[PDB]
Structure 1
Amino acid sequence: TLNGGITDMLTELANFEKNVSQAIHKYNAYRKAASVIAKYPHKIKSGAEAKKLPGVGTKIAEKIDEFLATGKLRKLEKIRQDDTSSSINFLTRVSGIGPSAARKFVDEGIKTLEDLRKNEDKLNHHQRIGLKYFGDFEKRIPREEMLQMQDIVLNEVKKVDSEYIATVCGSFRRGAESSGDMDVLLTHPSFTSESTKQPKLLHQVVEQLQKVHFITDTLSKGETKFMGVCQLPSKNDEKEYPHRRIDIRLIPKDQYYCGVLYFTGSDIFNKNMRAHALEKGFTINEYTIRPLGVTGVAGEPLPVDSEKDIFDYIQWKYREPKDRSE
């Protein structure tokens, strides 16, 4: 937490630019600088020192000098006082309410948690579940609970079909002591990039987890991505566990390594890696790494037998999941 003051400041600026300004590149600029500063192994003593890092330019250097001199940022101090900006930032904390819906709700004088409850019929299904579990979804998940949740999902997936393989990704696979939600990558040999030999491969898993009352709500659901809500069972007389967000991603089995690279993250690690892939003349998604022809259009998928092969193609030394927490 060596430069937590600075990185917190940059994260709040990033959220402002995303949520209020709707300037996504500024959002990504602030988050990149927050990321490079967060892994910097010295207590930053000036904006000039920070400007030496990639992603910190003149404007952020100046903000860091202001913050180091005073402990505050006038720009953020003004943003916190503006009622419209703080209302928009609040509403975007509801899953399913993004920058556009948040500004629309504010325009209708729907600006508080009480306002949202009073107007639940103006919400789509995603938003209604995000409001229902608003408090729960902002709690973090201790890794001990992640371990219990892992055991349920893997055992229940095994009961459906022992040929499924379920892998918990996200921050859990990076070794985090707590996670914001649970990310599950799913494969089954009937689903490859070559053919889908069995229908309902994700649905059957989802229904099994609902049947045993682990999955409690559904935000969205298609043939390959499920996003919903789950809950650990609690013991007699004990308070219930918080409800938790769970994402399940069914990936073609022959594309597992690209999929587990993507689902392990972090999000900034994936942006940096895919950006560097482009500079090396490749494009990476959760399925494939493909070369870029001279015209810059993706060619055919390159063979991939491990996460490290992907690293090898773009001339990066391998980084274990726990070193990907950017």
Structure 2
Amino acid sequence: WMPAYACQRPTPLTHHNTGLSEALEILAEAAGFEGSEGRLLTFCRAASVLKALPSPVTTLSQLQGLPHFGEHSSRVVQELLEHGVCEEVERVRRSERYQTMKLFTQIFGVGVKTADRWYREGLRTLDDLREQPQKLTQQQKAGLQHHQDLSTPVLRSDVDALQQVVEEAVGQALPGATVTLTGGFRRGKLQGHDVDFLITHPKEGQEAGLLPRVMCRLQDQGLILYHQAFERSFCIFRLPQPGSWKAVRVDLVVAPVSQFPFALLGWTGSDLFQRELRRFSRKEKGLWLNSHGLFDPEQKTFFQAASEEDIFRHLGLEYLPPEQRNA
């Protein structure tokens, strides 16, 4: 019944098994902190299966036959159903290691390997890092400086204001260029950790050199707190608010129009949906997918797509709109 790849099934934003999926996602995050991407992926995939089910799981029997449920994930669910808590999950939650790794990796510019080195050196708080600025890259310094604002959910009103100023700068940089909201907001999320935008021009090649021109125009309007030929810019914007301002993470991506459906698909996510789609493409169809194209390595040709629908069709998949890609 339930397909094994997340790209083969609809996953809505609101689902019926949050308690169970949240517990499995804690274990997935902890697996990542200990350097096991494989265990992280299994726990994420198991959590995602539960998000696609039509009803609450109330009895362990309802897991039988589900993909990515084996002995470990099933026992977590059984303990949650039988007792309301999973001892392993609670032990991870309360551990100093998990809490500190979560704190550090949430900083823009810090991943697991950096966080783990700092943990091993005895560092535990954001003030600990601030007291040792020479150990920070420029990106990390920006992430730490703006950490409180970046921990505030981004709202739709923020998205709408940012889209206007990005459209203004893009139109000043290149007439006819377009701006498309991507990321979680395109999947219907009401909040986010950032705003993602994809920029193109209908005439192939006209977008060459665009992103530096857009960045210069935003900087001159005082809108940029942090950035840095390029085609992806992971920015922090100074977003005006009533009487003040707040820092907001914004990702700006430029693609030629030939690549636009592939970039739109990749940048709309979810992260797990796209990893699963790329895995499906290669392992089941023999085709190589990324945000630039879909390559047949035996004919040595790229699939020409005019839409996301075209890509799903070439992969033999039922089309899913963005709001059903919340894997």
Same fold (TM over 0.5): yes
Which residue number in structure 1 is paired with residue 237 of structure 2? 230
Judge conservation of contact 2:258–2:304 (CA < 8 Å) in 1. Answer: no
CA distance in 2 between counterparts of 1:198 and 1:187 reads 6
1:303-322 → structure 2 map (5 Å cutoff): 303-322=304-323
CA distance in 1 between counterparts of 2:285 and 2:294 reads 12
State the AA in 1 paired with 2:24.
L
Q: Deviations over 1:148-191 (max 9, x none)?
A: 21111112211222132221111122222222211111224676
CA distance in 2 between counterparts of 1:198 and 1:303 reads 19
Pair 25,145 (structure 1): closer, same or farther in 2 beyond 3 Å: same
Residues 1:102 and 2:115 aligned together: yes
State the AA in 2 paired with 1:200.
G
SS in 1 for 2:38: helix
1:198: how far off? 7.5
Q: Which has the higher contact order (CA 8 A, sep 6+)?
A: 2
RMSD: 2.0
Pair 140,39 (structure 1): closer, same or farther in 2 beyond 3 Å: farther
Aligned residues: 312
Which residue number in structure 2 is paired with residue 57 of structure 1? 70
Report the identity percentage.
Answer: 26
Q: Deviations over 1:39-93 (max 9, x none)?
A: 3121111333134322222210111001111221211222234333432232112
1:222: how far off? 5.4
Judge conservation of contact 1:258–1:286 (CA < 8 Å) in 2. Answer: yes
Which residue number in structure 1 is paired with residue 166 of structure 2? 153
The two structures have a TM-score, normalised by structure 2, of 0.89
CA distance in 2 between counterparts of 1:68 and 1:241 reads 45
CA distance in 2 between counterparts of 1:28 and 1:268 reads 9
CA distance in 2 between counterparts of 1:275 and 1:40 reads 22
2:32 to 18, 24, 34: 18
1:180-191 → structure 2 map (5 Å cutoff): 180-188=193-201
Judge conservation of contact 2:207–2:254 (CA < 8 Å) in 1. Answer: no
Which residue number in structure 2 is paired with residue 271 of structure 1? 275
State the AA in 2 paired with 1:56.
F
State the AA in 1 paired with 2:305.
V
SS in 2 for 1:229: strand
Residues 1:5 and 2:19 aligned together: yes
Stretches of structure 1 that go unaligned for 5 or more consecutive residues are: none
CA distance in 1 between counterparts of 2:251 and 2:297 reads 31
CA distance in 2 between counterparts of 1:139 and 1:39 reads 28
Which residue number in structure 1 is paired with residue 255 of structure 2? 251
CA distance in 2 between counterparts of 1:173 and 1:198 reads 23
State the AA in 2 paired with 1:107.
R
CA distance in 2 between counterparts of 1:171 and 1:82 reads 30
Judge conservation of contact 1:51–1:61 (CA < 8 Å) in 2. Answer: no
